[PDB]
Amino acid sequence: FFDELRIGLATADDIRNWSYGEVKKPETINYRTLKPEKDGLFCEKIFGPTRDWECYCGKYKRVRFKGIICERCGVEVTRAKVRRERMGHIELA
Amino acid sequence: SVPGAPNRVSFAKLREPLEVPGLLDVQTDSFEWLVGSDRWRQAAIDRGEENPVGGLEEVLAELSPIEDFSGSMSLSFSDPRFDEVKASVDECKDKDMTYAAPLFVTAEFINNNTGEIKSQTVFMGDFPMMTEKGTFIINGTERVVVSQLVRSPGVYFDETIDKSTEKTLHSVKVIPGRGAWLEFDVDKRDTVGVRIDRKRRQPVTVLLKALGWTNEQIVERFGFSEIMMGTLEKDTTSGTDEALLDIYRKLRPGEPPTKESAQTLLENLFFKEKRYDLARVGRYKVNKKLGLNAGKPITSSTLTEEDVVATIEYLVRLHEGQTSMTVPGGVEVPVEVDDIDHFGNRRLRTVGELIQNQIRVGLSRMERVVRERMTTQDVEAITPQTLINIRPVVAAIKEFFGTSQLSQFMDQNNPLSGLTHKRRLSALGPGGLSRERAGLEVRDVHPSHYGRMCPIETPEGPNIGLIGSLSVYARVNPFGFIETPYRKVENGVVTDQIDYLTADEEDRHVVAQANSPTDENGRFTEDRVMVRKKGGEVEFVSADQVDYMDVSPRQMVSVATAMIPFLEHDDANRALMGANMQRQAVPLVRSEAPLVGTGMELRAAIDAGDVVVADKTGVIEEVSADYITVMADDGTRQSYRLRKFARSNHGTCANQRPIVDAGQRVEAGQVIADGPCTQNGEMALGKNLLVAIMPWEGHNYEDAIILSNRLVEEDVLTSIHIEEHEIDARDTKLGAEEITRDIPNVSDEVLADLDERGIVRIGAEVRDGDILVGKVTPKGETELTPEERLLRAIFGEKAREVRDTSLKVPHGESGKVIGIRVFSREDDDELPAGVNELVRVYVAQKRKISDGDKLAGRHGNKGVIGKILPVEDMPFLPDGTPVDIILNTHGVPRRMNIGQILETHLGWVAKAGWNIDVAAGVPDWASKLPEELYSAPADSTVATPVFDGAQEGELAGLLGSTLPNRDGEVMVDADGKSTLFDGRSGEPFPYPVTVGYMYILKLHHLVDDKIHARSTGPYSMITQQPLGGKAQFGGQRFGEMECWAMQAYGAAYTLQELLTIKSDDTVGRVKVYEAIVKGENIPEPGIPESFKVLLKELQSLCLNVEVLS
Amino acid sequence: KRLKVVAAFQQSGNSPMGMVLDAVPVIPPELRPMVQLDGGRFATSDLNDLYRRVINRNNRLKRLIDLGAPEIIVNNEKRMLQESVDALFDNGRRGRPVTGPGNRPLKSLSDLLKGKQGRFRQNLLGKRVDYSGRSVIVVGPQLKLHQCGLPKLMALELFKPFVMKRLVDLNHAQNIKSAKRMVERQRPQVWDVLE
Amino acid sequence: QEGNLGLIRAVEKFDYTKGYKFSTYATWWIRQAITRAMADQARTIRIPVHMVEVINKLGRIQRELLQDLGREPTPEELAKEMDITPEKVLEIQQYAREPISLDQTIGDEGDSQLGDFIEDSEAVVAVDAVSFTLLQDQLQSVLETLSEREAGVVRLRFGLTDGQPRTLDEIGQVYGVTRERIRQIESKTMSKLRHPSRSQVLRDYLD
Amino acid sequence: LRGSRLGAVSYETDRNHDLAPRQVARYRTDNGEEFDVPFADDAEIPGTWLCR
Ligand SMILES: [Zn+2]
């Protein structure tokens, strides 16, 4: 439901809150095997999986598990549509 | 003239003193000049020219001699060569490779420090040699080069008034071939401020002081002017170094000035060929405009300081307003302001110069690279081949054809379309009028277009005016100015000397109209003759005043506009529309020449190159549908191959067929085979059929058209169309892609017409969605869903690890496979990198006319097909023949094209023979009718030359003197009307209706390929919106004005549905589809992707857009 | 004027700290995707480049502070970091714009919505829609004022979902996919349902 | 800046005791740092140092060998001097590829973009989303409810009820039967269900 | 042309009333903040983690 749209000036804390991870590395995708890197601009750990309800290490690949965060690579099994819904932040020096 | 021309009686009353010249000379002659063919030098020499130079030889002579920084050694180029084309035209086109021939230039090296010299040939790439039909073939596609209209170099005197102060100021803009421009000025305050470049303005006195002339010299030659009288005392500077240094600082502020570089830099930008250059044309124009170097053929091609002071002198004289002036040493010349759109300074650069520009750029870059590479190498073992790297020139030539906006797919919709594409003139493209600006003022007709550029033929889109076709009789002067022929006339007598004149040189004389009368000797019968005059105006003058005359009435119209009978009875708008539409006529299965037409239809075909012609007189030996053979009279045998069912660039059929029989004695230049739109060597773009002008039950309301079912039964308007599908098999990182008959998840009956190698059989009929080529590709996704596992375990389809990505017919296309081609890396075919195999399949289909098709006449009367009616529903003449087409009456007068009525009446006169009795002499209305027109048989053909056609009196007499039918009666009275019987009720119509035979076309804007619609299917990735365009399931666009209309209706819910559910609501589309399939209630729409993406963007910009409730 | 500017912060709750940044957000990847095209081509939005120009210049700065480099080095690094962030947010308002291969300036975040293209001016004024068709029009003199004639093929394909629903309802097809396949080839016994 | 880093690392090794000049020693380290950075982060896709090395070798050889014959070297000529076989050379050439930008404007106007006509291969198709549900309402709901406990094995064997497929013995021990008994009842169920009389309804999904 | 995303789509039965048992752990960070992570039934207890 929509009543009005407010446009404030975002502070540092809001920017930190909007992000589930920090981009600590400048690579986009691996030149070989064509997958996102562990800390790159396309990392699955930050923006979610690229395959529906799958995992980076392949240990979890079914809707049998959803919302579970993997204990070895950090990617949570969830719909792939989250990759257009989650943001990241860069902490400036 | 033409041996095989069918006898077509013509209404022509005037005689032709000059036959129509070649219709493709503009392209071929320019190309021959570019390559410098000896067969072009032989003609250039005849023009009284000594030691003519080819264009490429000119480009090489520009860089001849070459030198380095210290002139230790010099390089040189000369003598381009051409060995032979790599392959034939047909082989080059079918092997989708590029037509070209090797180019060799002989290079020479001289050592100044030692005197050692050497020379050898250097391979300088492969040059795309032109074909005989004036086209190039690149990557298996035929392309044409369209000339570009531009502003010629010279001095442009101009004037303008000031709105605020009502003062007039003058300027002299000078545009060079290359470099930086400059312009004089006369400010309202009398300050003569030059803007030497995009830099700022200063008085011209400083410009003149900076080079040579002192303070006391200026008074010698300009001691009769007021503005300079004031200027010589308004300014204050006597030191040449100061003026030089002042101009140096203002030109390049912030740089260290020196007393020698001050002269060095100014000389490096106006008076040196390596930076600033005016072409051969520029010097000619400047010299004749100002009278300098009268008659001298001097080769100078860059500014001369004498001409600059002559320019300021001319400006001074013009500001005063004197009629003429004279430069000391030159000749007397007139003083006037120059028109910028006048074709005396607007010039067209053709294919030759367009190619030469790119060659020049490539050679310049190559010269830069070689002058860099020279330094490292030694001075004994060095050779030109080691020095030169031909990469830039070849790369730039190859980039020109494949990327230049002036290289265009040839419009192979019909022979006339291609013929009028090669002769097109364009103002757009690089180096011309920027498409963003597109000034509205330059689009209108200027009085100099007469006989040079057609005023009727232009695109009807936003490109109106900017693009037009060349005239029929026009030829291009070597300088790039369009000439036109005129008959020399003398003291009341017309002579046999035809002279080509340019616009400027024609402006000096008086030119009379062609239609004016003359006696047998050539004397003017009438005392006062109507002529044209210098202002581009129409006046009357006595006999003594006349000085020239036009060559023929058709001189001012192009080829296409010339093929419209009774053009003078049609307004310019409808004539333009008809000329444009004549280029959209699709060829039919069987061609039929118009019953009534111009005399041009013949040549427009022969010069189009789509009709096989005899190369030598002789006898036909053997004739076959695939090729013809002829035996010359000098013991020589020639063989011509005929193209069959070939695809055109636009999808039509480029069929050819013979017209000769064994034992026929042909003559040189005689048509042997017909092109797509040809019959007996005459252009046949459509069909002539029976038409009656009358409204009919509203089915033809608002310019719609009604057709008899006969035209569908006997395939009168059926056309063949061939599409070309492709698919390439190429490797991937999970495995290679294979072409095979077998593909997963299909029945064996789906593969009925598939070879063992996957490709469909030749001649097999393919429906929508059928398989043309089976191509499985690696998938490797092993973890199938448990339900699929169970199903595949139940049945025999255990499992597979590959996809079914086969090539399938587009949803909407169907036909029969007429051909297949396969290219494979297995035999080292030139497959572009990254491809293993490639297969092309041709699918051809016949198309009968149907509802929604578009037909038009030659007079801009196009319409859709509202209804096709049974033969028994059509109105029929008393003899019983039904009418084929019926056109609404109300459209004829308001749209204002009466030429179609005369066309219909003369078509009836031609269909049924005519004869006029001679008892009391010839009838008065037939006093001037030629003898051969007195009597003609049935189903004859007539020619009505444009601007010399049959006057309405002669046509009325012909209507009144028609012959009867088989029953000895006349169906159409002397007024061109006949009674008609209603096919529905049977009662005769209360009043007579006008009937005849009209020649109609079939336009390529068919309904068979424009209908499309979408329910649900593929979308766009990034935008999450349904994609559109040519592809299947192309969605429609709900623009902004549509939203405004919905808002005005107050349709809040429908607007939301059209904006969220049906466009970009990813979670809503599936739910709506499943609700429809289940019949449940439609769920309310959710948040569209657009708003979410906008919110995320604004958040990314560190703006905390928070939604409130 | 200075009052009209400052009073915005007065009693508005938003402190002026917002206009000094300690962390720069990253737009979700799908709005700057890395797409594999046919033949192995990859395509990616210019944003990915600009972001890297930050993550690089920041990272090196994180190193330069560790090494204790002279004042000049660190000052230059921080100036480059500020310039890179400025280019990332809105390119071209300062100095010359950062350009990619050839001669073309990269599109920044502000360019996504400020120019002729973008959400506000381009993407929000109309969009493509499903369940729609187009075709030439002809005169029907036999029509009532509230009637219009539609081609058989267009109407069938456009009503496909309702057609399948009714076909499966009347036992002509055992399931939705069977009705779909039947409609694909326009089987004769569907017109009585389409009507 | 990277040259400055190289200078720093040079100064932490310049040794006066050898008598050499600072410039002579520091030039090498400056080049090292600058080239390492330029090969590490000059591409959107990071081709590692060892791979960009061989890529540069291939590029230089291709550029240089042209003067020997006047042609751009092909895989045969390149392999004849790179000491590697043509297929590896092709792989290297593919690996050296770089991504283009979607924001380029195509169509002779500044209205369309390269990216508007990108068809999505992952986009959900509604019909399938419906069809599967129907199958879930036709396979699991109807055909399963025809053999009671004999059909119960299919629920665990194929994991239709949970998604975890089970081995024979693993579902033999939930009841009081051996793995081979589970195999036998599974064979009975497969024989009975595979018969056309019931498969006629289920076949039409991918017949 | 057809575009790819290095991903895929699946449509199997989602639900919430039947779920695998989470094992929830919490981690304290050197900056003073705390976070939570739900793990699977494997009963693993990782000692270290990298947080948001
Ligand atoms: Zn994992």
Q: What gap in Å lies between CA B446 and CA B449, rounded to an integer? A: 6
Alpha helices in B961-1059 (DSSP H): 1040-1049, 1052-1056
The token duo for B226 is 């007021």
Give A24's contacts (C-beta < 8 A, 6+ positions apart). Answer: A39, C55
Residue with tokens 């480049």: C49
Q: What is the resolution of this structure in A?
A: 3.9
Look at residue D29 and give its three-state secondary structure: helix
**Cis amide prior to C70 (ω within 30 degrees):** no
In whole angstroms, what separates CA D128 from the centre of its chain? 26
Q: Which residues of E touch A74 (CB under 8 A)?
A: 50
Ligand 1 centre distance from Cα of residue A57 (Å): 4
Task: Work out the minimum CA distance from D30 to partner chain B, whole angstroms.
Answer: 27
Give the integer Cα–Cα distance in Å for E52 and E36.
10
Which chain D residues have any C-beta within 8 angstroms of a chain B C-beta? 67, 70, 102, 108, 115-120, 123-124, 126-127, 129-130, 132-133, 135-136, 139-140, 154, 158-160, 163, 165, 190, 193-194, 199, 202-203, 205-207
Among D43, D44, D101, pick the best mutation site for testing chain C contact (most C Cβ within 10 A): D101
Cα gap C59→B862, rounded to integer Å: 69
- A34 to chain E, any CB pair closer than 8 A? The answer is yes
Q: Which strand (E) or helix (H) includes residue B370?
A: helix B351-373
Mutation test of the interface with chain E: which of B807, B808, B1021, B1030, choosing the one with the most E Cβ atoms within 10 A?
B1021
Q: How open is the CA angle D74-D77-D82, to the nearest 5 degrees?
A: 110
Per-residue three-class SS string for A3-14: CEEEEEECCHHH
Whether C24 and A28 lie within 8 Å, measured CB to CB: no
Alpha-carbon gap, residue B214 to B239, rounded angstroms = 9
Tell me the two tokens of residue B182: 């400059």
Record: contact A8-B783, CB cut-off 8 A? no
Determine the residue of chain A that is closest to B1096 in CA distance. Answer: A85
Chain B stretch 769-808, residues whose beta carbon is closer than 8 A to a beta carbon of chain C: 769
Taking each helix axis from N to C terminus, what angle separates C46-67 and C71-89, rounded to the nearest 10 degrees? 160
Whether the Cβ atoms of residue B686 and residue B1003 lie closer than 8 Å to each other: no
Please give the C-alpha separations between residue A91 and each of A87, B354, C53, C62, in angstroms, as whole numbers: 14, 56, 14, 11
**What percentage of chain A's residues is helix, strand, coil (to nearest 5)?**
15, 20, 60
End-to-end CA distance of chain B: 89
Q: Which residues sit opposite B144 in a β-bridge?
A: B408
Greatest distance between any 2 Cα atoms in chain C: 91
Structure tokens that stand for C132 in this block: 């729609």
Q: Phi-psi category of B51—alpha, beta or left, where left has phi over 0 and alpha has psi -120 to 50? A: left
CA B504 to CA B288: how far, in whole Å? Answer: 11
Closest C-alpha to C73, from D8, B995, A37, D66: D8
For residues B80 and B36, is the Cβ–Cβ distance under 8 A? yes
Q: Are B454 and B470 in contact (CB under 8 A)?
A: yes
Handedness of CA A58, A62, A67, A71 (dihedral sign): negative
Strands (E), B417-502: 424-426, 467-469, 475-476, 482-489, 494-501
Output the CA angle B337-B341-B344, nearest 5 degrees: 75
Does A17 contact chain D (CB < 8 Å)? no
Tell if the CB–CB gap between E20 and A71 is shorter than 8 Å.
no
Please indicate if any CB of chain B lies within 8 Å of the CB of E2.
no
Chain D residues whose CB is inside 8 A of the E2 CB are: 119, 121
To the nearest 10°, report the CA torsion of C87, C91, C94, C97: 100
Q: What are phi and psi of D45, to 5 degrees?
A: -105, 125
CA distance B290 to B307: 8
> Given an 8 Å threshold on Cβ–Cβ distance, is C46 in contact with D99?
no
- Cβ-Cβ contacts under 8 Å between A and B: the total is 44
What's the 3-state SS for B462-474?
A: CCCCCEEEECCCC
Q: Looking at the complex, report in whole angstroms how far the Cα of residue C5 sits from the nearest Cα belonging to chain A.
A: 15
Question: Subunits that touch chain D (at least 3 Cβ pairs < 8 angstroms)?
Answer: A, B, C, E
The verdict on A62 touching E (C-beta cutoff 8 Å) is yes
Write the burial class of residue B766 (CB in 10 Å: 0-12 exposed, 13-18 middle, 19+ buried): buried
Question: Using CA of residue B1009, residue B1013, residue B1014, residue B1015, what is the dihedral sign?
Answer: negative
A contacts of E14 (beta carbons < 8 Å):
63, 66
CA D97 to chain centroid, in Å, comes to 16
Q: Where are the alpha helices (DSSP H) in B837-911?
A: 891-895, 899-911
Q: Which two tokens stand for residue B868?
A: 């096709």
Q: What is the dihedral of CA D146, D150, D152, D155, to 10 degrees?
A: -90
Which residue type is seen at B359?
A: I
- State the sign of the Cα–Cα–Cα–Cα dihedral B881, B886, B889, B891: negative
Residue A86 with chain C: CB contacts under 8 Å: 28
D45:A29 CB<8 A:
yes
Rounded-to-integer distance, Cα D92 and Cα D100, Å: 19
C157/B contact by beta carbon, under 8 A:
yes
Both tokens of A52, joined, read 């529906």
Q: How far does CA B728 lie from the centroid of its chain?
A: 33
Asked whether the CA dihedral B281, B286, B290, B295 is positive or negative, the reply is negative
- Residue A57 known to bind ligand: yes
B161 in reach of chain C (CB within 8 A) = no
Question: d(Cα B692, Cα B995) in Å, to the nearest integer?
Answer: 4
Taken in order B732, B738, B744, B749, the sign of the CA dihedral is: positive
Taking contacts as CB-CB distances below 8 angstroms, the residues of chain E near A67 are 22, 38
Chain A contact present for C62, CB below 8 A: yes
The answer to whether E32 contacts chain A (CB < 8 Å) is: no
Q: Would you call E5 and D121 a contact, using CB atoms and an 8 Å cutoff? A: yes
Instruction: Pull the structure tokens for residue B279.
Output: 């072409």
Q: What's the rounded Cα separation, in Å, for the pair D125 and B645? A: 41
Residue B34: name the closest of B390, B357, B365 by CA. Answer: B357
- D200/B766 Cα distance (integer angstroms): 30
Q: Which tokens in the block code for residue E51? A: 């947080």
CB-side neighbour CA atoms (13 Å) of B279 = 16
Which of D122, D134, D155 to probe by mutation at the E interface, max E CB count within 10 Å?
A: D122
- Residue the block writes with tokens 């009727």: B456
Task: Judge: E20–A65 Cβ closer than 8 Å, yes or no.
Answer: yes
What is the Å distance from ligand 1's center to A53 Cα? Answer: 11
Render B141-166 in DSSP notation, one character per residue.
Answer: EEEEE-EEEEEPSEEEEEEEE-TTT-
CATH number given to B467-549: 2.30.150.10
- Cα(B903)–Cα(B923) distance, integer angstroms: 23
Instruction: With beta carbons under 8 A apart, name residues in chain A contacting E39.
Output: 68-69, 71
Question: DSSP letter string over D32-98?
Answer: HHHHHHHHHSSSSS---HHHHHHHHHHHHHHHHHHHHHTS---HHHHHHHHTS-HHHHHHHHHHT--
The distance of D125 to chain E (nearest Cα, Å) reads 10
**Burial grade of A46 (CB within 10 A; 0-12, 13-18, 19 or more):** buried
Chain C contact present for B1097, CB below 8 A? yes
CB contact under 8 A, E40 and A65: yes
Stretch 9-48 of chain E: residues touching chain B, C-beta under 8 Å? 10, 12
Nearest partner of C40 among B974, B1076, B183, D93, judged by Cα:
D93
Count CB neighbours of B640 within 10 A: 16
Say how far apart CA B1087 and CA A5 lie, in whole Å: 14
Contact of B859 with B1001, CB cutoff 8 Å = no
Q: Tell me whether strands B942-943 and B9-10 are parallel, antiparallel or unpaired.
A: parallel
Count C/E contacts: CB-CB distance under 8 Å.
Answer: 14
Instruction: Report which residue type is found at B1007.
Output: V
User: Which of B230, B228, B258 lies closest to B244, judged by CA?
Assistant: B258
The residue of chain B nearest to residue A14, with distances taken between CA atoms, is B1104
Whether residue E3 and residue C37 make contact (CB cut-off 8 A), yes or no, is yes
Smallest CA-to-CA distance from B77 within B30, B122, B38 is with B122
How distant is the Cα of C16 from the closest Cα of chain D, in angstroms?
33
Contact call for A7 and B1109, based on CB within 8 A: no
Q: Which residues of B392-416 are buried (b: 16+ CB within 10 A; e: fewer)?
A: bbbebbbebbeebebbeebbbbbbb
- Find the Cα–Cα–Cα–Cα dihedral C139, C145, C146, C147, rounded to 10°: -30
Q: How far apart are CA C118 and CA B1090, in angstroms?
A: 11
C-alpha dihedral sign at B45, B50, B55, B56? positive
Distances (CA, A) of B85 to B27, B137, B853: 19, 12, 44
Cβ–Cβ gap A63/E50 under 8 Å: no
Say whether C43 and D100 touch across the interface (CB within 8 A): yes
Which helix (H) or strand (E) segment holds residue B816: the answer is strand B815-824
CA nearest to B4, candidates B770, B769, B611, B850: B611
Q: Is A87 on the interface with B (CB under 8 A)?
A: yes
| Greatest CA separation for chain A | 49
D contact residues 113-142, partner A, Cβ 8 Å cutoff? 122
* Distance (Å) from CA D163 to ligand 1 centroid: 19
**Residue B361: strand, helix, or coil:** helix
How many angstroms separate the CA of residue E39 from the nearest CA in chain A? 6
- DSSP labels, B546-608: --EEES-GGGGS-HHHHTSTTGGGB-HHHHHHHHHHHTTBPPPSS----SEE-STHHHHHHTT
User: Does the annotation place A73 within a ligand binding site?
Assistant: yes
Instruction: Locate B1044 and state its tokens.
Output: 């405004």
Chain E partners within 8 Å of B1021 (Cβ): 3, 5
